């Protein structure tokens, strides 16, 4: 029947970007009219696909990826970009066929004096390859000095909280993000437009 996207966009609570969530939509019909005629969204950047032509199309599988970041960082939910998120938490390929959406969530994800439940990963030995996901808490050895325990400026915790406060500024206020990825394979196309 209807493809379950309201369970993805209307989730009571989302996840941290380093631990990003993927939900696969399959064998169903969807009107994206909920999505694109909306006006409640900050970010609506589509790649390889007109979002207005989505109901006239069929795909083999659809992947809804959801997470939370700041607004200064959405730019990074984009093809071919760099920085803390793109390089170490969530990567989009240059060959992205899909759409990316976000909106302010300062009313759901912030707390007076800091909401710490949202974390991003500060560093990795290498850059995350497309669609990769990393949840490791391995003490990061900055100083190239043997690391045991956890110590100082030379051994570091790789994750950082966002400390969301409602009184923060918009680029520092919370944004829920949904990456909708649309795939055509050499097999049957279940996920289609209403018409």
């Amino acid at each position: 029947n209807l493809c379950p996207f309201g369970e993805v966009f209307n989730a009571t609570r989302f996840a941290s970007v380093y631990a990003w969530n993927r939900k696969r939509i399959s064998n169903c019909v969807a009107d994206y009219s909920v999505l694109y005629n909306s006006a409640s969204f900050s970010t609506f950047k589509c790649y390889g696909v007109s979002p207005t032509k989505l109901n006239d199309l069929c795909f083999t599988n659809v992947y809804a990826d959801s997470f939370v970041i700041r607004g200064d960082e959405v730019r990074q939910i984009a093809p071919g970009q760099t920085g803390k998120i793109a390089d170490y938490n969530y990567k989009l390929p240059d060959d992205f066929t899909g759409c990316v959406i976000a909106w302010n969530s300062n009313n759901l994800d912030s707390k007076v004096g800091g909401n710490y439940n949202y974390l991003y990963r500060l560093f990795r030995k290498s850059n995350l390859k497309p669609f990769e996901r990393d949840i490791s808490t391995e003490i990061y050895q900055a100083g190239s000095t043997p690391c045991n325990g956890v110590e100082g400026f030379n051994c570091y915790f790789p994750l950082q909280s966002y400390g969301f406060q409602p009184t923060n500024g918009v680029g520092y206020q919370p944004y829920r993000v949904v990456v909708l990825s649309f795939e055509l394979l050499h097999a049957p196309a279940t996920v289609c437009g209403p018409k």
Partner: peptide, 21 residues
Amino acid sequence: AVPSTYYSGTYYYTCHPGGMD
């Protein structure tokens, strides 16, 4: 300045030149 980080109720504080608010 930087937020502290609270992973699982284990407190850690990290001052990162790459990463302070």
